[PDB]
Amino acid sequence: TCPFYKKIPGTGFTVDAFQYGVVEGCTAYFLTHFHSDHYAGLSKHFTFPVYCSEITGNLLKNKLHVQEQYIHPLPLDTECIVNGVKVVLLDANHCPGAVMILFYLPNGTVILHTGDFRADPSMERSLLADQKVHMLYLDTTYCSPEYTFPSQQEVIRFAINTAFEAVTLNPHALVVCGTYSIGKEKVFLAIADVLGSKVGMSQEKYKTLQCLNIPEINSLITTDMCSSLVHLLPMMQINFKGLQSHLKKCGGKYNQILAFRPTGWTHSNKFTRIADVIPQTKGNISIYGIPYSEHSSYLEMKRFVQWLKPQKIIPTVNVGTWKSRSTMEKYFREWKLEAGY
Template sequence: MSVNGKVIPHTPLAVDFWQVRKCPGTRLFFLSHMHSDHTVGLTSTWSNRPIYCSPTTAALLRLKLQVKEKWIHPLELDEPYLLPMDDIGKEKLTVTLIEANHCPGSVMFLFEGYFGSILYTGDFRYTPSMLREPCLRTHTTIDVLYLDNTNCDPNRTLPSRQQATQQIKEIIRRHPNHNVVIGLYALGKESLLVELAMEFKTWVEVSFVRMQTLKALELPDVFTTEPGVGRIRVVEQSQICSANVHKWDKEQPTLAILPTSRPLVSFHPNVHVVPYSDHSSYQELEDFVSALKPTSLVPIVGKHVPASFSALLPRRKRHEILVPECVRHYMLSQPESQLSSSANTSPRRRHFQPLLPKGVLFDSPVRGAGKSGEEATEPDATEEEMDAEVSENDSDCILVDLSKYHTPKKNRGGTGDMCLNIVKTTRTPFETNAKIISGLYQMTYTVVHI
């Protein structure tokens, strides 16, 4: 599995990087969100080093990885926090968390200290409102921008999530007598599910494992584990295969929808791939970099960004970084020696008050029925992992990820025996500069308590 995290040079900081033996000088760890390619190496045995994240991510960290409470330090968004960078209280940094518009709990980190100003986006979907954040609006210089370059391809366009959601709604409206199966990974796109539930006045059936996550997120009450009570059902993306589609269709006419920015093509008339992305498009990244004008740019995924981005950077040199002696000593000391400082001098801890669950316009299902067949544990896989595993029965495959076969300068071993049949994709014209939908907690729903 790829590791989408970084150790910040000349500092004791790391973001989404948990391989401690590779960063012995790191003392402060930051988690941008809970997708598994950003938590590689982070387990329940984590100790001696504080983890800073958003309150929502903290809740998921406890639920999914069972990290001990003493190491988890949730920070509220949009508020600056002072953190110690040594064990004597002399040197501090300021960190501000900014909504990343990616998945529940995802944030960007703005670090300020002796090293200058560093903005680490983590995974994010850019929207112009981000530039109105007070911490960015008042800043004249970002010295280093760590950029989520997942979709940084000038030859590829993506619709806004609002446009992609409309495409999905139109597909469902065209098939009023069909059930709908949506293939998703373990975390993300919850706002899409809530919007579809409200639009079509139906419960969304999920597995017991997914329901645990949804309860932790305190989303509107549109989800159920009761089989057959709702028109929409969520499954793991890997379950969208020809055998299952044939099985579902025999029981009840069924559509399968894959909301993903991965370059998949469908080979079944009832399977629709919709380019719904939680990562910024190339044009959005260009707009973001052009507006911020950072002194330097570091890609989070891989080592390269398009040369056209270099033209967006101002011609100025970054000042030389002088690491204070107390910070050098801190980075060389044993982690145990910092327990009395960083663990006990936590930033202002604030009580997280999640949104209360809300009722919906349709009847509640009868509770206490048998468990759903989807109870099997869902892997914490994410869209950006691009897992290359092929089904044990290749003839059962109905999807192929074109990026594995058409990525330039990539050595591909094996015979590439993937099934290729008739292509059917769902892509409608869209404007690349359309208005971008807000994140999960910025959506507005009309609900009636029941």
């Protein structure tokens, strides 16, 4: 049964709630972004309206094959009426097509649902700066002070330099990047760029990428593996036994892989900086875990919440245990007492 934190009071609207069957009362199903925990349930047979970004609509149409008439894409940063209720979609700084949604209720209450987000100061000068927000449905993936990670720009810097050095030291070395969903395209697009290559990938992954309205995309990516020296592979496959496997397939065109595993947080964030990272090494194959996050650090979250000064906060992540719930509320109270709202 759909949990209360997926429902928007005083509307027929639900958010990321596609896996419960028909939800009694729901006139409209919003989808914040194309990630499978959020879309779980969708298929060609859905015949209720979906509201989502243009880019999420492309993925629905071409990867799940939902019928064009049930996909209502909306532009960002634009006041739109949906079943007689004003809404705005805002960029979430998560993966391509990912949005937060502003709901202006008839009674005058205002609700922000963040979907998944990496909070950023640029949001403080969006349409959000114009009015008060009473309820906040918040991505709490990393709502605990151990969760620090570097900026995306830092991480991209590290990657570009690592890659560029190896390739210039050994021109028969391959770069591999692991992937399993949309997100984090910047890692492989930045490396490819520095090296003068397109990124090579399977046919399903090329198709996924051709949905994303990335500008100049036909120049950056290809399905021809031989032609390219940055390859994408399934994240499952990014290990020694499966990289060796892949190192064979190329057929003696490269003598050394240098792979990158973009991760979220891992416990070595607690002890080591980005400039002091090292790989695992079994022969000629090296593997960097790099902590490129598309979720708020604790500090980024805390800041955003203290600027917003919401009257109420409803968690959408880590809500399944009383211990996580309790710890979260404790941080919410600290924040509010520090900030005086």
